[model samples]
Target: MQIFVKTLTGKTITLEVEPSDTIENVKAKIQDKEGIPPDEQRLIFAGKQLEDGRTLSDYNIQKESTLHLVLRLRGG
Candidate 1:
């Protein structure tokens, strides 16, 4: 299945991974595309934080499902 991922910076990326792909997997993929580390990444879906190891199937995500990957900003 394909998922549409968006960053807090308003960058959108599409990933084609299995429906069984975990939230961690999506985080890693976002890291690859946005250069943000998984530990520093926070994925929010429907206004809630996505738990680790949770797959798209767990969220009932289907093809073309869009998710927001909000990168936490730090440092002054």
Candidate 2:
């Protein structure tokens, strides 16, 4: 399946991934592509938090699904 990923910086990326791919897998892929760490990843879908180790199929993600992945920011 193909998924559209958007970053908090307003950058958008589209990738073709397997339905069996877990959120953690996608997080790792995004980290590689965007230079963000997996631990800092925050994937939100339908205003709900998407946990790691959960497959796209588990979330009922369909073809052309748009997923928003943001890097958690921390500061004083």
Candidate 3:
């Protein structure tokens, strides 16, 4: 299945994924294509934050699902 990931900066990334793929796995794909660390990537699907241990199917994500990515903020 294919999904779309968009950021606040208007950058969009298309990824090929499986329903069994975990949120952590998805974040790693984002890192590969955008240089954003998995730990720094927070994914939102269906208006809910995706957890690292959860699977795409767990969230009922379908093909061409569009997910929101927010960069994690760290304080100095």
Report the number of clashing residue pairs per model: 0, 0, 0
TM-score of each: 0.85, 0.87, 0.93
Which run of 10 residues does model 3 get worst, by summed lDDT? 67-76
Error of 2 at 72 (Å): 1.2
Query: 1 or 2, which is superior by TM-score?
Result: 2
Candidate 1 residues lying further than 4 Å off, grouped into runs, are 73-76
Q: Which residues of candidate 2, in runs, are more than 4 Å off?
A: 74-76
Tens-digit lDDT string for candidate 3 (13-34): 9999999999999999999898
| Whole-model alpha-carbon lDDT for candidate 1 | 0.83
Top model number, lDDT: 3
lDDT of 1 at 66: 84
For 1-76, candidate 1 gives per-residue lDDT tens digits of: 7889886678789998888999999888887887887878888877778886898889887899888887676666
By summed lDDT, the worst window of 10 consecutive residues in model 1 runs over: 67-76
lDDT of 3 at 33: 91
Q: Candidate 3 — what's its lDDT?
A: 0.94
